[model samples]
Target: TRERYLFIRLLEACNADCFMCDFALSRDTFRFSLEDFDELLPRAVEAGVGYIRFTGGEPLMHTDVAELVRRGTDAGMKMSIITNGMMLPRQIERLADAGLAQIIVSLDGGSAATHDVYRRSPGMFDNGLRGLRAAARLGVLPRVNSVVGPHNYTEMPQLQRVLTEAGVRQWELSALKLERAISYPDPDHVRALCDPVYDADPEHMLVPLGKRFYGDTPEEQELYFSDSVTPRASAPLCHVVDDVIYLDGKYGRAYACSCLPHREGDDEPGGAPLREDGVIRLDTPAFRTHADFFRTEGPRVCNGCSTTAAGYSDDIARLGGVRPWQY
Candidate 1:
């Protein structure tokens, strides 16, 4: 019983200057305008999409986010956001009243000293705590997603305590893409940093360390690199592509999986803009053509992909694959 997922890169603009990401370095001004939602939401509902996640440099930065969430809710889609939490203090009330189901706040550390430093945005950690508490206060379950790296991996236990005290139940731990990375985490050997604070559900996006990508840890090579989950699938590694659709509304483009910018030349538009048709769809020629690549060559070149993308795709392929309301 699964319906497809849709993610809108509502815009590429962010307020922070995070060192690992180049989003803030090269900013985009275009946002998913009111007109875009007027056309796209109905089409998404007609396409039988079960979820709609408003993602971005900062989705809360969108001026019409609450209205967008309200529209998606009316269309019977689960409305969620992957925000940096700066806007949450101001936007959470409007979003809750708009029928928001959940929020996944990107919090990198337990203390502002780490999270704010990582984000290069002062006071973001406190804002995240306030947002989490506000979400809990308004009956909206909140989840925290941390990109664990050398800078903050040791703080995971403390972060867990902070979140627990803030009324957050689920925490997602993910590894960093080593390229252009400021740091990376332990490979589940020297320390229990990679251990699950919640359950050991693979779907919580806890990715195992691939042999090629451990940071400047000790030379205990085989022991750490040997950290592997029992291989679950005997088949090939084609990421679940068809069920996920990424719409970069400002660019007016669509993609099969969100793991991109995962590979080179992936920044190319997956499909044409919805200029003439005025609606978003999966069956477009450009979209199908792009999906074919992920269906075929994705197995060989998935090393550059993000943990959430890889883990979530595999989750959808398994038995209890639906995104749980709790975590």
Candidate 2:
């Protein structure tokens, strides 16, 4: 049996508001209670989940996050978090003590002015830097993730220098994917900003070492690079799709992948609703159902997804691989 991976949205409230945040704009404000975890975790492990990622509007907003990390680690699952890094400075030791396997911090730019421009919050650049430094001091040396677009794609080299100075050994570069439900303040500017770099040759745009592009080849990169910028297959299948699940804490629902959206208004929004028996049968029939939909109709619904674009590209690069929740 394949050991599945789960990405749990621990909360829906964020301190730092970014301009391009789809989740922050659309998702409701909610947090996971300890009782929620106590009921769901064991079922997850029993369902063969061996890797867990605590994600969010901002996972650090939850007070019991470390305890939840402890619980996941204690269950023999390798745990990690994709955080904005503002609260990470204060919580690093607690999370390290709880056995967090890895930390990936979101760092969009190399400087405060550029970073704060998109992040829309003062002091985030300093806070993210301090958090990375603290993690480095404690021997974590988090992997840095930068969202690339018209806003920050040109800042890759500068961002790499800042991340290197903070002792980040790994870096991930991603493109922006706008959602239909929300209206950006300046969509044309955002689009214009990305056109130059996105239109450039993929091979020429790559920076060396940690600044490398997400894929090993240009052909592979195009598949997941989002149709807004580059041409893509209508419904490309992610290699690791079968082994991942996303849990929405507020609605008590589970999805095949973290990028799949569910809301109140849609006629047939996807995701398997968690059952009353506390048994999320995700890896069996549920997996097949979502897998079929993802293979056939997901791209039509999602419209050139970039949320897991880098992830899928990374997996394609790896070919045959492990790390259930690698992205």
Candidate 3:
């Protein structure tokens, strides 16, 4: 049983300038205003979105965040956020008061030296930990995000332990995306780091809870096995166009999913802005270019494409698919 949701980046602005990020951040294409969310909320409800994820450059930087959350909640939408832990504490009370469902905190490394090196923040490790503790105090379950890469692959187990100890019940492991200007290790560079971690999963300490979020199927999801050595899907890929929606903050465009950018490309508006009308006008010739991409195997370059995307396997292999998450 799944319900569709829309993910909007409140601000393209992020606190830490992590070199490992593939989101390709810069100051110009980043900043956005309250007017964007103000326009998005009502139409989102009309579109039947039960869940919404307010994401970043660090959504906390959005001046009207509380008002945005309040509007989403009041519109009968369950909301979540993906943030670096730095701003979480200050916003925790507002989020909890708004009845936010979850918060995704990036904790790529186990030690301060390690996480900071990757995140490019001197004291962010401690700050993130403090933020997690603060969220717990506010009765929020902050999920941990650890992207496995050459710089910190050795610290996976240690990071897992930290998550377990910190009471982060849900954890997600994403493979690093290799693209222009990305400093992180490409897939091959981190294979050694991923092998043991993926193997230990069938019996890891947090396997049960971890499985619930990642490896396991929803009650209605089916599982099939393949004889191929590489992980291959026995069933057809899930149709994300109908289930996942992504709204780009840079422009008011929306796409069926991440694989399809908010617009035709760097030049077009992705299906009209969500605040304008619920209709995507999928049949239009301009949208079919992206529609085909989302409907088929997504772009051949998404190193971290979601499993729900139609072309996840191709994307995984294109980016070096041997990581534990891929297996």
Instruction: Give the Å shift of residue 52 in candidate 2.
Output: 1.1
Comparing 1 and 3 on lDDT, the stronger one: 1
Candidate 1 residue-wise lDDT, 1-327, digit = tens? 457778888888888877777687446888787777777777777766778888878888788889999988988888888888987988899899999988888898879988999888998888988998999899886877777656676777677678767877556556554454242234454256535443344343333322122322344233224432112111254445667778877676677766542444666554545554655555477667777776766755554444445455555555447455421
lDDT per residue for candidate 3 within 279-298, as digits (tens), equals 43222344345555645543
- lDDT for each candidate structure: 0.67, 0.64, 0.57
- TM-score to native of every candidate shown: 0.80, 0.77, 0.72
Which candidate, 2 or 3, has the higher lDDT? 2
lDDT of 2 by residue, 232-257 (tens): 22325544456668887767667776
RMSD of 2: 5.6
Q: lDDT value for candidate 1?
A: 0.67
Once superposed on the true structure, which residue ranges of model 3 sit more than 4 Å away at CA? 22-25, 29-32, 180-204, 207-235, 259-289, 299-304, 307-327
Error of 1 at 12 (Å): 1.8
Candidate 1 versus the native: TM-score? 0.80
TM-score computed on alpha carbons, candidate 2: 0.77
